Amino acid sequence: TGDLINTVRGPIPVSEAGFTLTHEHICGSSAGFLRAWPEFFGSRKALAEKAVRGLRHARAAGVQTIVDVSTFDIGRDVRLLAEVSRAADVHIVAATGLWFDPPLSMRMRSVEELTQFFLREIQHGIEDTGIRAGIIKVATTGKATPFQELVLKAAARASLATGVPVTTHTSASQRDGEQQAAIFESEGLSPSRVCIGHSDDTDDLSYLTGLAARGYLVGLDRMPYSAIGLEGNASALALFGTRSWQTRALLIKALIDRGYKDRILVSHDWLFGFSSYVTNIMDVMDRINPDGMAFVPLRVIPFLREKGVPPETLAGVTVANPARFLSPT
């Protein structure tokens, strides 16, 4: 009791977060896009309605909180998040940071300037809303670009000043987490403040246990993603991969079996609208996973239970781990 986390509806006690999905999106887009071209999504109204239906379905399955890791350059619309959170009665934690599509006005900035931006979104509020970010999202796609090095350093500095955790996008097959770790540690950031994400995109347990041993949280966060049976769709293949959800879920058990139950975070990386990829990708996704953000509780958790993972362990992964991660520390 006592510790608090910021959500799009204001502060909540850490203990009320409950079953928490730590890497999710209401909408995957671009800065200013929803404001300029809402018809891309049918309408803003239709997008909101779809998101509310989706979050209510997750809620029914026992999800109490999601962390929307959409940054500025993912086109995060905090007003939209607040609206859908209110209508579905599911907590949403918003993010600061930068993903891999920053515009020039961000790309030209120094580490000091980026630190000031991230601190603004955490301490003051996002835009003119007063809604405060509760996590910092960063990204590499292979070896960090020079700018990405600055972003990771600024994220470490903002985290040290505020206690808010850092979470990452990686190219997992390229083992980006090792370089990300080195950068964070060079700034004196504690590994317990960091989740190395998309770590279920690889079956390389040497890579994953190496990180877990050092105290990093390992994000197994793309559970429903698979293009099995859609191999003729090049764009779906490239984004989803050729590994089954069962293959992804097996990594949760693998890390538990190797003593790392306290180092695992589980999610879908789902969304309800998606403009930063090919047209109609959302329709393809909705066909692969009609359950959306209820997929983890409905399919993954029972799968693990049937493999013999104890209820206490599953509760520790889906409740205790997100709570420790999100609590400002």
- Binding residues for Co ion (CB under 5 A): 169, 269
Residue 214: phi, psi to the nearest 5? -80, -5
92: Cβ–Cβ under 8 A, 6 or more apart, which residues? 7, 8, 9, 26, 65, 66, 67, 68, 81, 82, 84, 85
Q: Which is nearer to a second copy, 40 or 303 (CB)?
A: 40
124 is known to lie in a ligand binding site: no
23 is known to lie in a ligand binding site: yes
68 pairs with which residues across the strands? 24
What, of a second copy, Co ion, none, does residue 115 touch, CB below 5 to 8 Å by kind? none
169 is known to lie in a ligand binding site: yes
Burial class (CB in 10 A: 0-12, 13-18, 19+), 245: buried
Residue 282 has which token pair? 């959302």
Residue 217: phi, psi to the nearest 5? -80, 140
Q: Which is nearer to a second copy, 72 or 325 (CB)?
A: 72
What, of Co ion, a second copy, none, does residue 113 touch, CB below 5 to 8 Å by kind? a second copy
Q: What end-to-end distance do the CA atoms of the chain give, in Å?
A: 14
269 is known to lie in a ligand binding site: yes
Q: How far is the CB of 269 from Co ion (least distance, A)?
A: 4
Burial class (CB in 10 A: 0-12, 13-18, 19+), 279: exposed
Q: How far is the CB of 225 from a second copy (least distance, A)?
A: 18
Q: How far is the CB of 90 from a second copy (least distance, A)?
A: 25
What, of Co ion, a second copy, none, does residue 72 touch, CB below 5 to 8 Å by kind? a second copy
What, of Co ion, a second copy, none, does residue 31 touch, CB below 5 to 8 Å by kind? a second copy
As a whole number of angstroms, the distance between CA 113 and CA 129 comes to 21
57 is known to lie in a ligand binding site: no
Q: Which is nearer to Co ion, 77 or 269 (CB)?
A: 269
Q: How far is the CB of 277 from a second copy (least distance, A)?
A: 6
Contact in structure between 97 and 10 (CB atoms under 8 Å): no
Instruction: Please name which of 90, 81, 92, 27 lies closest in space to residue 58, comparing C-alpha atoms.
Output: 90
Q: Which is nearer to a second copy, 100 or 303 (CB)?
A: 100
By DSSP bridging, strand 4-7 and strand 10-13 are antiparallel
Q: Which is nearer to a second copy, 30 or 192 (CB)?
A: 30
What, of a second copy, Co ion, none, does residue 169 touch, CB below 5 to 8 Å by kind? Co ion
Residue ranges for the known binding site are 23, 25, 137, 169, 198, 269
Residue ranges for the known binding site for Zn(2+) are 23, 25, 137, 169, 198, 269
Residue ranges for the known binding site for Fe(2+) are 23, 25, 137, 269
